[PDB]
Design a protein around this ligand. Sequence first.
Ligand SMILES: *[C@@H]1O[C@H](CO)[C@@H](O[C@@H]2O[C@H](CO)[C@@H](O)[C@H](O)[C@H]2NC(C)=O)[C@H](O)[C@H]1NC(C)=O
Ligand code: NAG
Ligand code: NAG
Lengths: 48, 48
Amino acid sequence: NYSRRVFTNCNYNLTKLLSLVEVDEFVCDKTTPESLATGCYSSLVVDW
Amino acid sequence: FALPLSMKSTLAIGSAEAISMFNYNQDYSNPTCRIHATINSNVSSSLN
Ligand SMILES: *[C@@H]1O[C@H](CO)[C@@H](O[C@@H]2O[C@H](CO)[C@@H](O)[C@H](O)[C@H]2NC(C)=O)[C@H](O)[C@H]1NC(C)=O
Ligand SMILES: *[C@@H]1O[C@H](CO)[C@@H](O)[C@H](O)[C@H]1NC(C)=O
Ligand SMILES: *[C@@H]1O[C@H](CO)[C@@H](O)[C@H](O)[C@H]1NC(C)=O
């Protein structure tokens, strides 16, 4: 039972998530974590 | 240099963390091999 959030019409500070955790592995396709914090999106779906 | 294996994903290609943006940015224009080695205390006592 996991939860999903969709963020639209707001400015995100993805550093807040990454400076609070330590990353053990990232798997990306068509993007990178360096470019996930700089690009502009239509929506941002987060499942955790 | 010295770095733990818990941060082995911090040196990976594309990351928004402090190592790959302040400490070590790797040049991928040439043939490279990043070896995450480990030296135990028995070997690292005669060669000091
Ligand atoms: C399964 O997860 C959902 C959401 O992740 C939980 O639903 C929330 O439940 C709380 C309290 O019951 C409510 O205040 C929220 O509004 C609910 N959110 C949504 C989106 O429905 C649900 O409780 C979880 N199930 C169990 C058994 O823990
Ligand atoms: C190092 O070698 C000795 C034998 O001289 C051995 O007893 C010891 O267990 C070795 N160290 C490790 C970490 O295995
Ligand atoms: C380091 O270890 C070597 C072992 O051959 C020894 O000769 C040397 O004196 C050591 N260096 C020190 C204690 O500063």
